[PDB]
Amino acid sequence: LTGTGVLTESNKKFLPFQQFGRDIADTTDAVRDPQTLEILDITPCSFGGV
Amino acid sequence: YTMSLGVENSVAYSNNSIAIPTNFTISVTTEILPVSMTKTSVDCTMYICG
Numbered sequence: 296l297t298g299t300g301v302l303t304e305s306n307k308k309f310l311p312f313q314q315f316g317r318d319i320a321d322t323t324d325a326v327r328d329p330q331t332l333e334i335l336d337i338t339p340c341s342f343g344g345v
Numbered sequence: 346y347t348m349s350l351g352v353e354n355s356v357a358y359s360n361n362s363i364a365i366p367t368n369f370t371i372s373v374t375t376e377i378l379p380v381s382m383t384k385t386s387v388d389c390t391m392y393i394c395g
């Protein structure tokens with residue numbers, strides 16, 4: 296699961312087998328770290344029209 | 346069922362009969378109109394190429 300974003304700890308409680316989390320419109324918004332099983336939120340790196 | 350357009354009313358017309366209202370009701374009627382969309386803008390490079 297390659298991507299670019301800001302990673303933080305999160306209040307999400309994945310079931311033991313679940314590895315990734317998705318928003319309403321398929322976009323990935325969380326992941327489980329594979330070496331210590333914390334659930335990380337993903338949000339896009341900040342952007343906007345100049 | 347075949348739908349009904351409204352109740353029938355044979356108006357009491359004759360060449361020398363008039364109906365005049367003896368009282369009134371002030372009616373307050375709500376009318377609702379759209380005026381503006383949500384203002385979208387899209388970075389078409391970030392949408393297409395990620």
Ligand SMILES: *[C@@H]1O[C@H](CO)[C@@H](O)[C@H](O)[C@H]1NC(C)=O
Pocket residue numbers: 329330331332
């Ligand atoms: C991964 O290895 C480290 C060092 O041995 C250990 O602290 C950690 O608990 C291990 N995690 C898993 C999910 O096995």
Ligand SMILES: *[C@@H]1O[C@H](CO)[C@@H](O)[C@H](O)[C@H]1NC(C)=O
Pocket residue numbers: 367368369370
């Ligand atoms: C007119 O209508 C009101 C209620 O809307 C009623 O109280 C009043 O007595 C009526 N007046 C007449 C002259 O019928």
